[PDB]
Amino acid sequence: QVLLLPFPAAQGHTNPMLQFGRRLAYHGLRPTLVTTRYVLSTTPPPGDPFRVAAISDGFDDASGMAALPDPGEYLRTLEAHGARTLAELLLSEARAGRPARVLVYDPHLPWARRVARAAGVATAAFLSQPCAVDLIYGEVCARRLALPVTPTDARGLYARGVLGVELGPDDVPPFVAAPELTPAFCEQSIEQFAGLEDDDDVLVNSFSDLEPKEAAYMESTWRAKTIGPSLPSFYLDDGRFRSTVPCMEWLDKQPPRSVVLVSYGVVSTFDVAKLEELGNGLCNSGKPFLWVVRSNEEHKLSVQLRKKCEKRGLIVPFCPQLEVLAHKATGCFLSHCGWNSTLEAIVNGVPLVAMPHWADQPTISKYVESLWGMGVRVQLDKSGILQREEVERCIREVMDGDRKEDYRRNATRLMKKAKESMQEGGSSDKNIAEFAAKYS
Numbered sequence: 001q002v003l004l005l006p007f008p009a010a011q012g013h014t015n016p017m018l019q020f021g022r023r024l025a026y027h028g029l030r031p032t033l034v035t036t037r038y039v040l041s042t043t044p045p046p047g048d049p050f051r052v053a054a055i056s057d058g059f060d061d062a063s064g065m066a067a068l069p070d071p072g073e074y075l076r077t078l079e080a081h082g083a084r085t086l087a088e089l090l091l092s093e094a095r096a097g098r099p100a101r102v103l104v105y106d107p108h109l110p111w112a113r114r115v116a117r118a119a120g121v122a123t124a125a126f127l128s129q130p131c132a133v134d135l136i137y138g139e140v141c142a143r144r145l146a147l148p149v150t151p152t153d154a155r156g157l158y159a160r161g162v163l164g165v166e167l168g169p170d171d172v173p174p175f176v177a178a179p180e181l182t183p184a185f186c187e188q189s190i191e192q193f194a195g196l197e198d199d200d201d202v203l204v205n206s207f208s209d210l211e212p213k214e215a216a217y218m219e220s221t222w223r224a225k226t227i228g229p230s231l232p233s234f235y236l237d238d239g240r241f242r243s244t245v246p247c248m249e250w251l252d253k254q255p256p257r258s259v260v261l262v263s264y265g266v267v268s269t270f271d272v273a274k275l276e277e278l279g280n281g282l283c284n285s286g287k288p289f290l291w292v293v294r295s296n297e298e299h300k301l302s303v304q305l306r307k308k309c310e311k312r313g314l315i316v317p318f319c320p321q322l323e324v325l326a327h328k329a330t331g332c333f334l335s336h337c338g339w340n341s342t343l344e345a346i347v348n349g350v351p352l353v354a355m356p357h358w359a360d361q362p363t364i365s366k367y368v369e370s371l372w373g374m375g376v377r378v379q380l381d382k383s384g385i386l387q388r389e390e391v392e393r394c395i396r397e398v399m400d401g402d403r404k405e406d407y408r409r410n411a412t413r414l415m416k417k418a419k420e421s422m423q424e425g426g427s428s429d430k431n432i433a434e435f436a437a438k439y440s
């Protein structure tokens with residue numbers, strides 16, 4: 001009866017929506033995770049308190065994304081099959097005596113809203129990106145900013161007290177500042193907001209103290225309510241643990257605050273040359289490091305670079321990232337600065353080396369370095385290349401610089417406020433409780 005519909009196969013949208021769903025189950029609601037038939041056949045289910053249900057994206061037996069690597073093509077296929085099968089699911093669930101009370105959906109599936117509203121099901125948008133990025137996309141949707149969005153447009157928003165930092169060219173969201181590079185992602189980013197005013201509720205995985213001006217503006221403009229960081233309650237010190245993963249055993253043997261965790265997420269791909277610069281930078285830093293290089297990227301790693309990494313590092317295809325970040329051995333996180341990774345670092349008080357690619361990452365990386373003060377951003381050379389020397393410099397700058405304590409201080413400060421927000425009486429907890437009562 002509360003249906004949860006993340007963008008399919010995006011763990012960064014899945015995890016936080018499941019964590020919201022767990023808190024709703026605490027309040028006595030009944031959550032169901034809605035995923036594709038493919039993901040359902042090929043992934044273990046979430047377990048209690050969740051039911052699971054399926055829709056189709058056109059590809060029930062193979063990965064549709066794999067088959068349809070042009071983003072606009074995959075997204076029109078998902079819309080056509082998904083909208084049909086979501087409507088069928090709303091009816092089958094009602095016929096099975098489990099009518100949906102509300103659909104909480106990722107607005108990167110904007111067809112979900114129309115499908116649900118036409119079945120008479122309430123709708124709640126769930127934004128898994130930061131308010132600062134979200135509100136820029138909403139301004140374009142509302143026809144208050146043209147494309148492309150410029151630094152001058154961002155400076156206006158700063159001047160008006162809506163953004164808390166002045167975004168330059170390398171900081172504005174590329175999907176709207178350089179829309180020709182990613183047409184389908186531009187349109188998807190802006191369409192999140194088309195019809196959002198028709199929703200019963202709008203939720204965002206952030207907390208007001210982290211993004212005060214932006215959260216306030218999202219609330220006044222879009223009715224968006226902060227409900228994050230939407231993470232396991234253990235990490236938030238909310239009293240209302242420890243795996244057997246082999247990389248964790250490695251981490252246990254390293255000294256306190258010694259290790260660099262390295263990940264560029266599950267989406268972006270790095271060519272052989274970029275992997276070479278990244279891995280050599282890690283080895284040249286002299287620090288112990290845990291390098292996540294996905295199974296689907298690891299063919300790009302040479303024998304000699306892997307051997308070089310054996311001295312002080314460990315390369316894995318996946319790690320339990322929250323458990324790593326919480327570990328006493330972890331000193332910093334060299335991250336692409338996707339929002340889930342950034343929130344996970346904040347909740348654990350871990351300083352950041354930001355290596356953004358696209359989406360929300362450039363904007364987050366500017367916040368990290370220039371407002372929040374919790375790390376540094378790598379500087380690309382004149383031709384856009386990340387050099388091993390710069391990877392190394394940034395690692396050493398956060399772990400050893402004159403400013404080491406500045407990044408730590410800010411990470412810790414933010415950590416405390418993130419926990420406050422989710423604990424009883426906190427700004428995000430209040431919004432969760434409001435929602436749970438509404439739908440009880």
Ligand SMILES: O=c1ccn([C@@H]2O[C@H](COP(=O)(O)OP(=O)(O)O)[C@@H](O)[C@H]2O)c(=O)[nH]1
Pocket residue numbers: 011012013015263264265266267292317318319320321322337338339340341342344
């Ligand atoms: O090796 C791992 C292990 C866990 N995750 C988890 O998967 C989610 C999505 O991560 P990603 O970095 O792609 O998200 P983003 O930071 O870009 O939003 C986050 O909850 C991560 O903690 C991961 O991404 N890589």
